[PDB]
Amino acid sequence: GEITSVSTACQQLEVFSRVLRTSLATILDGGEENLEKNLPEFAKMVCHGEHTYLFAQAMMSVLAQEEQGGSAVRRIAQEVQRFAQEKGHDASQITLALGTAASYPRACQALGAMLSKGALNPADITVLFKMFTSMDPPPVELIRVPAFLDLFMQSLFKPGARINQDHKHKYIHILAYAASVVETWKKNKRVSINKDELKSTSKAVETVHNLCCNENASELVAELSTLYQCIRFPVVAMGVLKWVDWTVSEPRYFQLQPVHLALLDEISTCHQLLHPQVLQLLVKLFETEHSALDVMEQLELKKTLLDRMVHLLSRGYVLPVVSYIRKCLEKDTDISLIRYFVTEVLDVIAPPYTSDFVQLFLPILENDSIADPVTEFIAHCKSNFIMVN
Amino acid sequence: GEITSVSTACQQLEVFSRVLRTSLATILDGGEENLEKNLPEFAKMVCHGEHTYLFAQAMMSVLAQEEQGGSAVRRIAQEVQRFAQEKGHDASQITLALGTAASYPRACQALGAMLSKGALNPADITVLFKMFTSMDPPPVELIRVPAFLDLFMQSLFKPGARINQDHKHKYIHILAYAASVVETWKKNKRVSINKDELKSTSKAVETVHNLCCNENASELVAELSTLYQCIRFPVVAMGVLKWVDWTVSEPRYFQLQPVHLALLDEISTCHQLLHPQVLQLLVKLFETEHSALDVMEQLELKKTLLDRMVHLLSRGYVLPVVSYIRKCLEKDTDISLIRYFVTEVLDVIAPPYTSDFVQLFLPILENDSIADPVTEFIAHCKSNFIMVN
Amino acid sequence: GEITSVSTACQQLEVFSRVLRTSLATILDGGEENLEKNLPEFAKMVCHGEHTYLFAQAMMSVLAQEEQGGSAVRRIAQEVQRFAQEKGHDASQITLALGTAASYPRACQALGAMLSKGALNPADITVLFKMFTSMDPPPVELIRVPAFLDLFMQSLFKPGARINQDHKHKYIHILAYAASVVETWKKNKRVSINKDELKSTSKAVETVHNLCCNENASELVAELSTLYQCIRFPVVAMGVLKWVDWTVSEPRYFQLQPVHLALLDEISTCHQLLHPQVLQLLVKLFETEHSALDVMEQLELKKTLLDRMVHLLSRGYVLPVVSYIRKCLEKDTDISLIRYFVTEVLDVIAPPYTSDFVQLFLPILENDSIADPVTEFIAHCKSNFIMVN
Amino acid sequence: ESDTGLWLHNKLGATDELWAPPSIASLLTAAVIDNIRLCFHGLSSAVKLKLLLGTLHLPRRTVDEMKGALMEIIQLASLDSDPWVLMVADILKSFPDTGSLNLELEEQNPNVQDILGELREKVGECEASAMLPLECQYLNKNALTTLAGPLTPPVKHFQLKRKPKSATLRAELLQKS
Amino acid sequence: ESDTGLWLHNKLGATDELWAPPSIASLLTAAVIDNIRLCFHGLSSAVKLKLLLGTLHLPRRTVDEMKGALMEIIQLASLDSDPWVLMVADILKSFPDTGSLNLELEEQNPNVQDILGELREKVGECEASAMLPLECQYLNKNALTTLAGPLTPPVKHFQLKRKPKSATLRAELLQKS
Amino acid sequence: ESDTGLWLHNKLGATDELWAPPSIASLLTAAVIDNIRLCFHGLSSAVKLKLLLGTLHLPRRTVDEMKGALMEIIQLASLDSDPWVLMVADILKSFPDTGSLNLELEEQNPNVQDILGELREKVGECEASAMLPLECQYLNKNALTTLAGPLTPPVKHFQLKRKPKSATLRAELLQKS
Ligand SMILES: [Cl-]
Ligand SMILES: [Cl-]
Ligand SMILES: [Cl-]
Ligand SMILES: [Cl-]
Ligand SMILES: [Cl-]
Ligand SMILES: [Cl-]
């Protein structure tokens, strides 16, 4: 409810510490669903200065050491590291000093360079490649940095792109290595390295990479069966999701008769960890002002985007999806589109329902209740559910 | 604010107990006015299973033993017993085992039979009748069960009805006995039985019963003076109220030129305990969709129903009446009808006013304040009342 | 939220004391800005009876003795004393017995007489005048009573007025004495009296007094430079403000082509203590129903009154001014006028902004945000400010 | 009977039904009652709750005959693991001998103690103009006052200057005759 | 005077009036004051509150004459049963001798102690830029500063890039002459 | 260098910049590092915070050379008056020798103790289906399970009677080939 300037909140360490404590509490409460809202209010404070960034990241690293739920703080720290990156702040020096990355001179050097520049160069890629091919490769956790892996996404699956054919296998291998290789440790000593899945994963990435850069895609439908099989690899599904994003999000795309969106249903079915990104994309395309499209074309397109949400919902990502439809209803979107979402959802769901679902789906039902599965759902809820306190 | 499924709330005794504690607290807070709202949320939980019904009713019987306000819990228990009945659950076995009804074999047997079937039969009525005619009749509290007395209402005052003339006096006597007879007790020993009012009460019921079953009523206005005198007996007033209900509530009734509603004013004037039922009826008829009636006829009819509310209000049932008019204003009803209620009420009331009345009647006054007694009331309130905290 | 009758709150001393404690707390919280709202709810209770007025004023005098902030309670007491006056209650006897005014027989006698009658008479004015001309004059704090000084305002600066020329210098001198004379005390003993500013202040008042009573003003613009110089004296600025008030507030005034309002800008620039009165006047003229004025004339006139608010705002009275524009927006005034205030304010302000200002000016910005300095302000706020808790 | 516990599952194991099924009196044979002590340990809570509540639906004659067997079952239920079975066993322990339920339920029973503790205080807070039972609506004043005491008159929220429009309507309908 | 207490009821017993009625100074005869000690016990609180407050409306000459009788009445009021009468008697006890009210009111007076206790702390919390009395609005800076200290400057909520439209308006009206 | 502290103000005194300026590695000459111990006392907090954070941007070779001088400065910072300078000095004290930051920060540090105290309890409260780091989104199941354990399946908020419209769309696009 109260507002505060960034400068004031950072001037006193005492004051900054208190806001950090409540902000972090809120983000941990909001879960991954409300992450996109609760994050920037914290990140803006933390990224005010390099010293403020240092202190907050030191606090988050210590919390991340907790066996029970410490991973959730590591997520928050990575979200903030991305905020700094997108605002032109270089936080690679801090990120590497923050962990055990500095324990390996050569690799940490090459990794920090690329993280500072924000792109992948063949020089530092070869240095990493040779080391992971040797009899004694560095810990795989070193190349499993979100900021690093993303650089591969925009270099391998982005419409384009500038890349060297004599180095392409090195880019693919390092990515596939980060995605599939499994190490075993005992008392901080690495016992074995499992590379069984490295061959098939590397092939999956290489296959889809060749398809994406090609485009024209009209050849996509022909190799769809191969494409679906590769999507089962999470690293590949991320790539396809990003590729579909860059393809569709770019203006002057909707002049065709859409296979790009159809792939999203396969992504959702295979990978629950990608559901909040799939939805994030679907709501980005749902709120775009298509000035080049015809009115009837805008309506059907939005219906198409809703069909993706209903599919996503049917994969077990229901509460955040239902929540979004209620938000644009109470606050814009025409009534016909909201009624279509209700119709389609009520056509595939059945009791028992949880109270958490009813608490969100019943209110959206009784705002403009004129449309029988609707009244039957209301009758069920009235019979089987109770308000407390 | 939070919602809960019935199944979940009943699975754990610990959890069920906590909800019972807060639900009962709320109902006791809401008074008889907010009873119709706060009851079903509790009743649905309690009536989930016979074992849940048993536990809750055992808890309520123990609370009912409190000399100071225990009667209010007995009311709640009876409201829940009715909920179970209306949902097809048989809770007669529990109800009788709950009290000292089981102390009298013959009577308790006949009383449970009829309570289980939900109707009155001449067989079990005769068994009760002979016992209350003998030199040593059972305690009158035994036939003073709400569920039992209601069976008399739909058998004596309902449009109809199926009844035996050779048994009619037995039905009338038992009802009049429950309504008028007064026992004196000392150390759980009955000292005397007062039947002084049994003759006149029995006659009052018999008189109005003959009038109601007759109908056509066009003969009602002729015997109106007799009818008003009988209404002074509360048991008869209940009958007339139920009869007026069944008469008017039945579709295709409003084709006549209404004496049935006029009787309600006499009910209200004589019996304060029947005010929440009178209002409950008036709001049921006020919310009915009369598709057979003309638009102008619908308007005047609703004005007529409002005239009953203003009369009821003038009998000291003001706060629940004022509260209802504010509810349909803030949330439907046309402005003209709301303005008529304001006009009529302000034409008969005068200072001093209580803060409780002003807190409800002043807000309804200043929503669309264009209609002088109105501004004069506002001037009084502004001069004599203060907001705190 | 809860409402209470005045009678009930005063019948029990215990109850009255509790309401006094919370009411006073609220008024001290509301500051001078929310004073006009939080005052009448307290004053109505206190002015219920003379005994209630006595008790409350005794409590406030004791609180006023606190060196740290006791002056704020003296303000509240004076506001209540005015409430009693405006409701026909005479509280002069209590007011004088409340302080050390009763220590000086002659003066206190004359001062109470005029305070009881509510006007200035030459008889009691001469008694005060002779005493303040003698070698040993009474304490100046005695004539520094708000209720007294106001009597001078309506006698010297009101359109008119009934006054004696042989006594006029006595009226002027006493006022100028109260405004400029500075005494020094040591252990409740008056050491010296400084009258250095008495001559120039007396002249300033006399000059503007002659101008105001004259009128026709069309001669006002000619002597504007003299008028601005006199306004620097706070006592004179009060007079001009009151005079402008009586002039403009009187119906059938807006038939001319306005210098009266232009003087308000000079008042605001010179005296921060008069800002809440300047605004109080501006909002009184902004809410007047000018039935004699043309629609286009009503629009431009309201724009003119807004120009005074923007000037006032630029003098450091911003938060109460911004707050009023938001109140009439959320609750009436046409959109064009609200957009003009936004335009003019955003044309003269620049970073840094306080969070207190943003918390009020940002919400008013994003209600109907279509009008670039607007979006640039929003961009600044989004970059530099954070919501907490 | 062979596998008498399996047979009770096919009769009362229905999760849909949570109340006594129609013709429950015929399902509880006297011989079955004597067979319940043999197979009770393996029964589910749902079936036990239907079994125990079933004793209330038996005629006074049938109950008195196997009251010894009923006491044995109710005792078994008072040693159960399910808190619901335990609570029901404490309410019915007085039934087979007296035909009435037990309302002394606070002994070493935290739930009941917490319920009655909090609500007894709440009940006493709302003794002012407390709502009466439904039967009171059917009673003449003297019976009403004997049973529940004098009624509290309605709060006077205002003062009537004149009588409403309904007062004239009563006189009219009385003039028609 | 016969039934002097009955006569006070017909003069001050008006429940509508809660302040000193017009010509209250003429109602309080010196002889009446000496008659109040005879009939005070039966008077209502309302009349006593009009009686006690009435002493403030009497001229200094009239008060000083029967100051002994006034002290006797105020003492009687300090032994009253009504808390309002008691509070007023404690404020006026200093008046007949000094002509000023008593502001020492905390001695064995829970109400006053609770009022001043809570508010003294509240008053100190809002000493920052506290609102000044009304007379300060009429004072020249030197008198103002002597009395209330330096004024706190307005909070700077922004920074002026340019002067508003009202600045040009001042120059115009100065050019017209 | 003469007035080496004045020169640091003209290079890092910019209040606008709160992060390491471009080419900060070239500004921190080895000789300058040895000059910081001479002029540190007069430096502002802003410049010190740019100075201390600047050590992270120096290559491992440059750091190891003047690690003795860096330890001396970091020690000086641990005796500063600004709480921000003190906090940063405690995090970097492990750097010039190990190349890694210090995460043992609770020793006599009320702020850190209060942060970690409250949040360690909060982190443990949300261990149920806690959000995973971003790298997990890129991993095959076996690597994912090794690193973060089995994923909690989605909560079943309902039961699917039929498959949605998107199921038919998959079959169509597979038939086209
Ligand atoms: Cl997965
Ligand atoms: Cl369910
Ligand atoms: Cl009655
Ligand atoms: Cl009143
Ligand atoms: Cl000033
Ligand atoms: Cl700022």
Residue numbers in the entry:
A (entry chain B), B (entry chain B), C (entry chain B): 186 to 401, 404 to 444, 449 to 522, 524 to 563, 573 to 590
D (entry chain A), E (entry chain A), F (entry chain A): 6 to 182
Please give me the paper's original passages concerning this structure.
Here we show that regions of human NELF-A and NELF-C form a highly conserved core subcomplex with a novel fold. One side of this NELF-AC subcomplex exhibits a conserved binding face for single-stranded nucleic acids.
Bacterial co-expression of NELF subunit variants revealed that the N-terminal region of NELF-A could be co-purified with NELF-C. Limited proteolysis and co-expression analysis with truncated protein variants showed that the N-terminal residues 6–188 of human NELF-A and residues 183–590 of human NELF-C formed a stable subcomplex (‘NELF-AC’). The structure contained one NELF-AC heterodimer in the asymmetric unit and was refined to a free R-factor of 25.6% at 2.8Å resolution. The structure of human NELF-AC reveals a novel fold and an extended interface between the two NELF subunits. NELF-C consists of 22 α-helices (α1’-α22’) and a small two-stranded β-sheet (β1’-β2’, residues 367–379) that protrudes from the surface. The C-terminal half of NELF-C (helices α14’-α19’) forms three HEAT repeats (H1-H3). Subunit NELF-A forms a highly conserved helical ‘N-terminal domain’ (helices α1–α5, residues 6–110) that resembles the fold of the HIV integrase-binding domain present in human PC4 and SFRS1-interacting protein (PSIP1). Two invariant tryptophan side chains (W24 and W89) on the NELF-A N-terminal domain insert into largely conserved hydrophobic pockets of NELF-C. NELF-A helices α7 and α8 are buried in the NELF-C horseshoe. Overall, the heterodimer interface has a large surface area (3690 Å2), explaining the stability of the complex in 2 M sodium chloride (not shown).
